[PDB]
Nucleic acid binder design. Structure first.
Lengths: 332, 5
DNA sequence: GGCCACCA
Protein backbone atom coordinates (compact mmCIF):
# COMPACT_ATOMS: atom_id res chain seq x y z
CA UNK A 1 0.00 0.00 0.00
CA UNK A 2 0.98 3.69 -0.30
CA UNK A 3 1.21 5.68 2.92
CA UNK A 4 -1.23 8.59 3.12
CA UNK A 5 0.98 11.26 4.68
CA UNK A 6 -2.18 13.18 5.70
CA UNK A 7 -3.49 10.28 7.85
CA UNK A 8 -1.77 10.76 11.25
CA UNK A 9 -2.67 7.32 12.65
CA UNK A 10 -1.36 5.61 9.50
CA UNK A 11 1.87 7.62 9.72
CA UNK A 12 2.28 6.62 13.35
CA UNK A 13 1.92 2.93 12.43
CA UNK A 14 4.49 3.36 9.67
CA UNK A 15 6.88 5.12 12.03
CA UNK A 16 6.47 2.46 14.72
CA UNK A 17 7.59 -0.18 12.21
CA UNK A 18 10.62 1.84 11.10
CA UNK A 19 11.67 2.72 14.67
CA UNK A 20 11.42 -0.87 16.01
CA UNK A 21 12.74 -2.83 12.98
CA UNK A 22 16.24 -4.31 13.29
CA UNK A 23 16.69 -2.93 9.75
CA UNK A 24 15.65 0.63 10.63
CA UNK A 25 17.65 3.55 9.27
CA UNK A 26 17.39 7.25 10.12
CA UNK A 27 17.48 8.01 6.37
CA UNK A 28 14.33 5.87 5.97
CA UNK A 29 12.51 7.64 8.80
CA UNK A 30 9.81 10.06 7.64
CA UNK A 31 11.80 12.67 9.56
CA UNK A 32 14.48 12.50 6.83
CA UNK A 33 11.87 13.99 4.41
CA UNK A 34 11.61 16.99 6.73
CA UNK A 35 15.44 17.29 6.45
CA UNK A 36 15.29 16.79 2.66
CA UNK A 37 12.54 19.38 2.37
CA UNK A 38 13.49 20.08 -1.27
CA UNK A 39 12.56 16.48 -2.24
CA UNK A 40 9.06 15.01 -2.56
CA UNK A 41 8.18 12.07 -0.23
CA UNK A 42 6.47 8.92 -1.52
CA UNK A 43 6.32 6.00 0.95
CA UNK A 44 5.07 2.42 0.56
CA UNK A 45 4.84 -0.69 2.72
CA UNK A 46 3.64 -4.29 2.76
CA UNK A 47 1.58 -6.15 5.35
CA UNK A 48 1.77 -9.78 6.42
CA UNK A 49 -1.31 -12.08 6.50
CA UNK A 50 -1.84 -10.89 10.11
CA UNK A 51 -2.27 -7.16 9.18
CA UNK A 52 1.17 -6.12 10.47
CA UNK A 53 3.63 -4.08 8.43
CA UNK A 54 6.52 -6.43 7.40
CA UNK A 55 8.40 -4.12 4.99
CA UNK A 56 8.66 -0.43 4.20
CA UNK A 57 10.39 1.88 1.73
CA UNK A 58 10.65 5.66 2.17
CA UNK A 59 11.41 7.37 -1.15
CA UNK A 60 12.33 10.95 -1.95
CA UNK A 61 11.92 12.29 -5.48
CA UNK A 62 14.40 14.76 -6.91
CA UNK A 63 14.66 16.87 -10.05
CA UNK A 64 16.87 16.02 -13.05
CA UNK A 65 17.67 17.87 -16.31
CA UNK A 66 14.94 15.77 -17.97
CA UNK A 67 11.17 15.43 -17.71
CA UNK A 68 11.58 12.64 -15.15
CA UNK A 69 12.24 12.54 -11.40
CA UNK A 70 14.93 10.61 -9.57
CA UNK A 71 13.36 8.37 -6.89
CA UNK A 72 15.78 7.53 -4.09
CA UNK A 73 15.30 5.35 -0.97
CA UNK A 74 18.39 6.22 1.10
CA UNK A 75 19.63 3.13 2.99
CA UNK A 76 16.31 1.43 2.38
CA UNK A 77 14.11 -0.46 2.11
CA UNK A 78 13.52 -1.48 5.73
CA UNK A 79 13.39 -5.29 5.53
CA UNK A 80 15.78 -8.19 4.80
CA UNK A 81 16.62 -7.16 1.24
CA UNK A 82 18.12 -10.59 0.50
CA UNK A 83 14.48 -11.84 0.65
CA UNK A 84 14.22 -10.87 -3.01
CA UNK A 85 10.71 -12.26 -3.57
CA UNK A 86 9.54 -9.95 -0.78
CA UNK A 87 11.70 -7.14 -2.19
CA UNK A 88 10.07 -7.49 -5.62
CA UNK A 89 6.62 -7.16 -4.02
CA UNK A 90 7.64 -4.02 -2.17
CA UNK A 91 9.31 -2.45 -5.21
CA UNK A 92 6.18 -3.26 -7.21
CA UNK A 93 4.14 -1.17 -4.76
CA UNK A 94 6.74 1.60 -5.01
CA UNK A 95 6.54 1.62 -8.81
CA UNK A 96 2.73 1.85 -8.60
CA UNK A 97 3.03 4.88 -6.30
CA UNK A 98 5.55 6.60 -8.54
CA UNK A 99 2.99 6.62 -11.38
CA UNK A 100 5.53 6.93 -14.18
CA UNK A 101 7.11 10.12 -12.85
CA UNK A 102 10.58 8.68 -12.15
CA UNK A 103 13.17 7.24 -14.50
CA UNK A 104 14.67 5.01 -11.79
CA UNK A 105 14.05 3.92 -8.21
CA UNK A 106 17.44 3.61 -6.48
CA UNK A 107 17.99 2.03 -3.07
CA UNK A 108 21.31 1.41 -1.28
CA UNK A 109 20.67 -0.82 1.75
CA UNK A 110 23.25 -1.66 4.37
CA UNK A 111 23.49 -5.32 3.46
CA UNK A 112 26.79 -7.08 2.87
CA UNK A 113 28.03 -7.46 -0.68
CA UNK A 114 28.12 -11.00 -2.03
CA UNK A 115 28.45 -12.37 -5.55
CA UNK A 116 25.44 -14.67 -5.14
CA UNK A 117 23.27 -11.75 -3.96
CA UNK A 118 24.53 -9.49 -6.76
CA UNK A 119 23.61 -12.14 -9.32
CA UNK A 120 20.16 -12.71 -7.77
CA UNK A 121 19.34 -9.01 -8.03
CA UNK A 122 20.46 -8.87 -11.69
CA UNK A 123 18.40 -12.00 -12.40
CA UNK A 124 15.33 -10.15 -11.07
CA UNK A 125 15.96 -7.26 -13.48
CA UNK A 126 17.76 -4.86 -11.15
CA UNK A 127 20.87 -2.96 -12.24
CA UNK A 128 23.52 -2.95 -9.49
CA UNK A 129 26.39 -0.51 -8.90
CA UNK A 130 29.12 -1.84 -6.62
CA UNK A 131 32.35 -3.56 -7.67
CA UNK A 132 31.27 -2.98 -11.27
CA UNK A 133 31.88 0.79 -10.72
CA UNK A 134 34.46 3.04 -8.99
CA UNK A 135 35.71 6.73 -8.15
CA UNK A 136 35.52 5.83 -4.41
CA UNK A 137 33.04 7.83 -2.28
CA UNK A 138 31.90 9.56 -5.51
CA UNK A 139 30.94 6.34 -7.38
CA UNK A 140 27.78 5.99 -5.29
CA UNK A 141 25.70 8.56 -3.40
CA UNK A 142 26.50 6.98 -0.04
CA UNK A 143 29.94 5.38 0.51
CA UNK A 144 29.84 1.62 -0.07
CA UNK A 145 32.77 0.86 2.30
CA UNK A 146 32.02 1.73 5.90
CA UNK A 147 33.89 1.61 9.20
CA UNK A 148 31.51 -0.07 11.64
CA UNK A 149 32.31 -1.09 15.24
CA UNK A 150 30.42 -4.22 16.36
CA UNK A 151 29.88 -3.67 20.08
CA UNK A 152 28.25 -7.07 20.46
CA UNK A 153 31.77 -8.52 20.28
CA UNK A 154 32.32 -6.91 23.73
CA UNK A 155 29.32 -7.93 25.87
CA UNK A 156 30.91 -6.97 29.18
CA UNK A 157 32.47 -3.66 28.08
CA UNK A 158 31.59 -0.79 30.40
CA UNK A 159 33.61 2.09 28.95
CA UNK A 160 35.04 2.95 25.55
CA UNK A 161 38.57 1.99 26.62
CA UNK A 162 37.44 -1.61 27.29
CA UNK A 163 37.13 -2.09 23.49
CA UNK A 164 40.66 -1.25 22.44
CA UNK A 165 44.31 -2.32 22.42
CA UNK A 166 46.77 -0.48 24.62
CA UNK A 167 48.12 1.75 21.82
CA UNK A 168 44.59 3.04 21.14
CA UNK A 169 43.82 3.40 24.86
CA UNK A 170 46.76 5.82 24.99
CA UNK A 171 45.45 7.90 22.09
CA UNK A 172 41.96 8.10 23.60
CA UNK A 173 43.27 9.02 27.04
CA UNK A 174 45.43 11.84 25.65
CA UNK A 175 42.79 14.59 25.00
CA UNK A 176 41.16 14.12 28.40
CA UNK A 177 44.54 14.18 30.17
CA UNK A 178 45.29 17.43 28.35
CA UNK A 179 42.08 19.02 29.67
CA UNK A 180 39.61 18.40 26.84
CA UNK A 181 36.00 18.12 28.06
CA UNK A 182 32.96 16.97 26.08
CA UNK A 183 29.33 17.90 26.63
CA UNK A 184 26.37 16.97 24.50
CA UNK A 185 22.82 17.91 23.75
CA UNK A 186 20.44 18.79 20.96
CA UNK A 187 19.58 22.45 21.56
CA UNK A 188 20.27 25.54 19.45
CA UNK A 189 23.34 26.17 21.63
CA UNK A 190 25.09 22.96 20.56
CA UNK A 191 23.94 23.45 16.97
CA UNK A 192 25.63 26.86 16.84
CA UNK A 193 28.80 25.33 18.27
CA UNK A 194 28.63 22.54 15.70
CA UNK A 195 28.05 24.96 12.85
CA UNK A 196 31.03 27.15 13.75
CA UNK A 197 33.35 24.13 13.75
CA UNK A 198 31.69 22.73 10.61
CA UNK A 199 32.01 25.88 8.49
CA UNK A 200 35.53 26.47 9.85
CA UNK A 201 36.58 22.98 8.74
CA UNK A 202 34.89 23.44 5.36
CA UNK A 203 36.79 26.69 4.68
CA UNK A 204 40.11 25.09 5.71
CA UNK A 205 39.40 22.32 3.19
CA UNK A 206 38.03 24.85 0.66
CA UNK A 207 34.88 22.73 0.37
CA UNK A 208 31.15 23.39 0.29
CA UNK A 209 29.03 22.90 3.43
CA UNK A 210 25.32 22.42 4.05
CA UNK A 211 23.28 25.39 5.33
CA UNK A 212 22.50 25.53 9.05
CA UNK A 213 18.79 25.15 8.27
CA UNK A 214 19.54 21.58 7.15
CA UNK A 215 20.60 20.74 10.71
CA UNK A 216 17.86 22.87 12.26
CA UNK A 217 15.24 20.81 10.41
CA UNK A 218 17.00 17.68 11.65
CA UNK A 219 16.90 18.99 15.24
CA UNK A 220 13.19 19.66 14.75
CA UNK A 221 12.52 16.17 13.35
CA UNK A 222 14.57 14.17 15.91
CA UNK A 223 14.55 14.49 19.70
CA UNK A 224 17.56 14.31 22.00
CA UNK A 225 17.26 10.53 22.41
CA UNK A 226 17.84 10.17 18.64
CA UNK A 227 19.97 13.21 17.69
CA UNK A 228 22.85 14.35 19.87
CA UNK A 229 25.57 16.91 19.22
CA UNK A 230 28.87 16.35 21.07
CA UNK A 231 31.03 19.40 21.76
CA UNK A 232 34.68 19.24 22.86
CA UNK A 233 36.22 22.27 24.57
CA UNK A 234 39.39 22.95 26.53
CA UNK A 235 39.47 25.72 29.16
CA UNK A 236 36.37 27.23 27.55
CA UNK A 237 37.84 27.19 24.02
CA UNK A 238 35.74 25.44 21.37
CA UNK A 239 37.79 22.73 19.64
CA UNK A 240 35.68 20.18 17.80
CA UNK A 241 32.18 18.75 17.45
CA UNK A 242 30.30 15.80 16.02
CA UNK A 243 26.67 14.87 15.33
CA UNK A 244 25.49 11.32 16.04
CA UNK A 245 22.09 9.76 15.34
CA UNK A 246 20.81 6.78 17.32
CA UNK A 247 18.35 4.73 15.27
CA UNK A 248 17.65 1.03 14.87
CA UNK A 249 20.68 -1.09 15.77
CA UNK A 250 23.29 1.65 15.45
CA UNK A 251 24.59 5.02 16.51
CA UNK A 252 25.90 6.78 13.40
CA UNK A 253 28.59 9.47 13.49
CA UNK A 254 27.32 11.59 10.59
CA UNK A 255 28.77 15.14 10.70
CA UNK A 256 31.74 16.76 12.40
CA UNK A 257 33.86 19.89 12.51
CA UNK A 258 37.06 21.09 14.10
CA UNK A 259 38.62 24.50 14.58
CA UNK A 260 41.87 25.72 13.04
CA UNK A 261 45.17 25.13 14.80
CA UNK A 262 45.86 23.02 17.89
CA UNK A 263 42.84 20.89 18.78
CA UNK A 264 44.50 18.64 21.41
CA UNK A 265 43.13 15.39 19.93
CA UNK A 266 39.61 16.62 20.73
CA UNK A 267 38.11 14.62 17.79
CA UNK A 268 39.28 11.47 19.59
CA UNK A 269 37.42 12.65 22.70
CA UNK A 270 34.25 13.20 20.67
CA UNK A 271 34.53 9.66 19.28
CA UNK A 272 35.07 8.23 22.76
CA UNK A 273 31.96 9.96 24.14
CA UNK A 274 29.88 8.89 21.15
CA UNK A 275 30.98 5.27 21.62
CA UNK A 276 30.22 5.58 25.33
CA UNK A 277 26.67 6.64 24.40
CA UNK A 278 26.38 3.44 22.34
CA UNK A 279 27.63 1.36 25.27
CA UNK A 280 25.32 3.13 27.75
CA UNK A 281 22.28 2.46 25.55
CA UNK A 282 23.17 -1.18 24.67
CA UNK A 283 23.38 -0.34 20.97
CA UNK A 284 24.74 -3.11 18.75
CA UNK A 285 26.70 -0.97 16.26
CA UNK A 286 28.71 2.26 16.13
CA UNK A 287 29.08 3.45 12.53
CA UNK A 288 31.85 5.94 11.64
CA UNK A 289 30.77 5.94 8.01
CA UNK A 290 32.56 5.85 4.73
CA UNK A 291 36.17 5.40 3.70
CA UNK A 292 37.53 5.46 0.12
CA UNK A 293 39.86 2.44 0.59
CA UNK A 294 41.46 0.21 3.24
CA UNK A 295 44.55 2.29 2.95
CA UNK A 296 47.14 4.40 4.82
CA UNK A 297 46.81 7.03 2.05
CA UNK A 298 43.11 7.45 2.82
CA UNK A 299 42.83 10.01 5.60
CA UNK A 300 39.35 8.62 6.31
CA UNK A 301 40.63 5.07 6.83
CA UNK A 302 43.56 6.22 8.96
CA UNK A 303 41.43 8.17 11.44
CA UNK A 304 38.56 5.68 11.59
CA UNK A 305 40.89 2.69 11.99
CA UNK A 306 41.82 4.08 15.42
CA UNK A 307 38.28 3.07 16.45
CA UNK A 308 37.44 0.17 14.09
CA UNK A 309 40.05 -2.59 14.01
CA UNK A 310 37.90 -5.10 12.11
CA UNK A 311 37.54 -5.03 8.34
CA UNK A 312 35.32 -2.26 6.92
CA UNK A 313 31.85 -3.38 5.92
CA UNK A 314 31.31 -3.52 2.15
CA UNK A 315 27.68 -3.15 1.10
CA UNK A 316 25.80 -4.30 -1.98
CA UNK A 317 25.83 -0.73 -3.27
CA UNK A 318 23.10 0.94 -5.32
CA UNK A 319 20.23 -1.21 -6.61
CA UNK A 320 18.45 0.45 -9.54
CA UNK A 321 14.93 -0.47 -10.65
CA UNK A 322 15.08 1.02 -14.16
CA UNK A 323 11.77 2.52 -15.31
CA UNK A 324 12.66 4.89 -18.19
CA UNK A 325 15.68 3.20 -19.82
CA UNK A 326 16.35 6.06 -22.25
CA UNK A 327 16.74 8.62 -19.46
CA UNK A 328 18.57 6.03 -17.32
CA UNK A 329 21.18 5.60 -20.07
CA UNK A 330 21.56 9.36 -20.43
CA UNK A 331 22.04 10.14 -16.72
CA UNK A 332 23.74 7.03 -15.31
CA UNK B 1 29.18 16.82 -1.52
CA UNK B 2 29.44 13.26 -2.84
CA UNK B 3 29.95 11.35 1.87
CA UNK B 4 26.25 11.86 1.04
CA UNK B 5 24.14 11.99 4.25
C1' DG C 1 48.44 4.88 10.48
C1' DG C 2 53.59 5.48 10.85
C1' DC C 3 56.93 11.06 19.39
C1' DC C 4 54.96 12.18 14.35
C1' DA C 5 51.07 12.51 11.39
C1' DC C 6 45.64 11.74 10.84
C1' DC C 7 41.38 13.97 13.06
C1' DA C 8 34.92 15.15 6.76
Amino acid sequence: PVLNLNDPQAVERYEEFMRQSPYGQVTQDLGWAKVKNNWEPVDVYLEDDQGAIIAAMSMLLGDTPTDKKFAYASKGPVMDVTDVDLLDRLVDEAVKALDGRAYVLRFDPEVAYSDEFNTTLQDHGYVTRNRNVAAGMHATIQPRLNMVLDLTKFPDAKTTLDLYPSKTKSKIKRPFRDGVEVHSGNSATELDEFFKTYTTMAERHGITHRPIEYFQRMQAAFDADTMRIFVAEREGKLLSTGIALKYGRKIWYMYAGSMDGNTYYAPYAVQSEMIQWALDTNTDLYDLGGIESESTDDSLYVFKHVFVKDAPREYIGEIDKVLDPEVYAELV
Amino acid sequence: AXCXX
